[PDB]
Amino acid sequence: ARSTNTFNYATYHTLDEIYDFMDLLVAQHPELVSKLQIGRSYEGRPIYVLKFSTGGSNRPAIWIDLGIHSREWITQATGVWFAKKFTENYGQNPSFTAILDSMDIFLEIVTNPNGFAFTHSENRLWRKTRSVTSSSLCVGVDANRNWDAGFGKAGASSSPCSETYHGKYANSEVEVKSIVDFVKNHGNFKAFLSIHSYSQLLLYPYGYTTQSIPDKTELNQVAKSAVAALKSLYGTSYKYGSIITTIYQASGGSIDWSYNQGIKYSFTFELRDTGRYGFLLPASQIIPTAQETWLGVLTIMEHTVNN
Ligand SMILES: C[C@H](NC(=O)OCc1ccccc1)C(=O)NCP(=O)(O)O[C@@H](Cc1ccccc1)C(=O)O
Ligand SMILES: [Zn+2]
Questions:
Q1: Which residue in 94, 138, 150, 165 has a CA-CA distance of 20 to 30 Å to 249?
Q2: What three-state secondary structure class fits 261?
């Protein structure tokens, strides 16, 4: 580093290296990327979103967030490689270039900064935010149980010490509310992508009820395609389907909330692996994992642009 070109993508980085990488990239591509602060975390850290845009007014946008669960380190590293990928391929790749010429892409690499900081200094398997429940001494809320979609219903814990704790009311965590507000104010998101690990799954709604979304046929066919493009590189196999049906019942999840707000293409990716290394995926796996998951995400953006 000194430029994102000498930056090392095949290694895990700390919160400071990633935020400093963001400034390097914007500085290197000032007319394509900008850094927006959409909030501050519970402990007072800035929450950043990179906007990639080739111009326009309120262009149709794609939201992608990573690291809402802080111990899932393959997602922040994949986000860093994505962000680089976007500035390299815009101009050279024809379908990506055509997506960016008509749509804006919003990328949040570290959705949960306080827990990420905590996985480096004190506990590598921390999942939740770091908010302090005054009613309790256990710290933190599961941010993927805190959205207003089946909030507080089965599929989440109501105990503060649980690592699935939904929190006291929907959007109690400022890390969640900061996205909700940015995404209601813009008003023109067409796709909402949340990246997690692990298990090799591509999921769409719902997580809290077995009822079918009205557009199941389409999201299913889209998932089918993305999974096939992803598998093209290294043969990695992904399963896909609704959340409740494909990993387990979960309530208050973010993609059920964006899909209920009108954002039709709402999917969550569960990255490598399927359990052998789990959350502590070796660093040798970052690049093959980021390359193949990019082919799946590019498939969804392409469907979004034309349908
Ligand atoms: C809480 C859980 N504990 C855990 O120990 O999971 C182990 C496990 C691994 C793989 C398969 C099954 C189980 C966990 O961290 N799961 C990983 P996740 O954060 O990727 O799962 C998403 C699933 C999900 C996705 C979208 C909406 C709702 C739910 C989640 O629980 O938020
Ligand atoms: Zn997760």
A1: 138
A2: coil
Buried-state track 207-236, b at ≥16 Cβ within 10 A, e below 16: bbbeeebeeeeebeebbeebbebbbeeeeb
Bond prior to 273 in cis (omega within 30° of 0): yes
Domain at 68, CATH number: 3.40.630.10
Q: Total domain count for the chain? A: 1
Give 159 Cα–ligand 1 centroid separation in angstroms. 17
CA quadruple 83, 84, 85, 91: dihedral sign:
positive
DSSP tag of 109:
S
Number of H helices, E strands in the chain: 9, 8
Which residues are catalytically annotated? Answer: 270
3-state DSSP assignment of residue 184: helix
Residues at Cβ < 5 Å from ligand 2 ion: 69, 196
> How far away, in angstroms, is 123 Cα from ligand 2 center?
16
Query: CA 263, 222, 240 angle in degrees (round to 5)?
Result: 100
Number of neighbouring beta carbons within 10 Å of residue 153: 13
Nearest Cα to Cα of residue 236 among 178, 169, 296: 296
| Method used to obtain the model | X-ray
Q: Please calculate the CA angle 177-181-187 and round it to the nearest 5 degrees.
A: 145
Domain extent at residue 223: 1-307
